Ligand binder design. Sequence first.
Ligand SMILES: [Cl-]
Ligand SMILES: [Cl-]
Ligand SMILES: [Cl-]
Ligand SMILES: [Cl-]
Ligand code: NA
Ligand code: NA
Length: 129
Amino acid sequence: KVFGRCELAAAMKRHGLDNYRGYSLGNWVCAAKFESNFNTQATNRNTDGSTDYGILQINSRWWCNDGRTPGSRNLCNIPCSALLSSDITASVNCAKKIVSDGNGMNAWVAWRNRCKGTDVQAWIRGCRL
Ligand SMILES: [Cl-]
Ligand SMILES: [Cl-]
Ligand SMILES: [Cl-]
Ligand SMILES: [Cl-]
Ligand code: NA
Ligand code: NA
């Protein structure tokens, strides 16, 4: 599913991401924009052989099982395919674990490089939330 901007903001808020670990909703929408262009089915292979899945491009190296990432973990206890669903519950619940792991949203390199420090509230501007 390819979400609209305000549609995704609303879904993320319904699933408890607004101000989660102190990160306002616009941070999460901005991260999703540059990780996946709001497409739940996005996948990308990393140079190390791991793969990133879903709206927030969560990595099979640590967070989900795809059966093809040697030496990896599955800390969210989900198949990576669950991160591709039109229902964002699995991605949100796993993102909550990731952002709590010590480095906040810096875990998402695209957030650090493209969202951090910017006017992220623009990403939810005008949305009925
Ligand atoms: Cl957009
Ligand atoms: Cl915001
Ligand atoms: Cl594996
Ligand atoms: Cl933080
Ligand atoms: Na990525
Ligand atoms: Na894994």
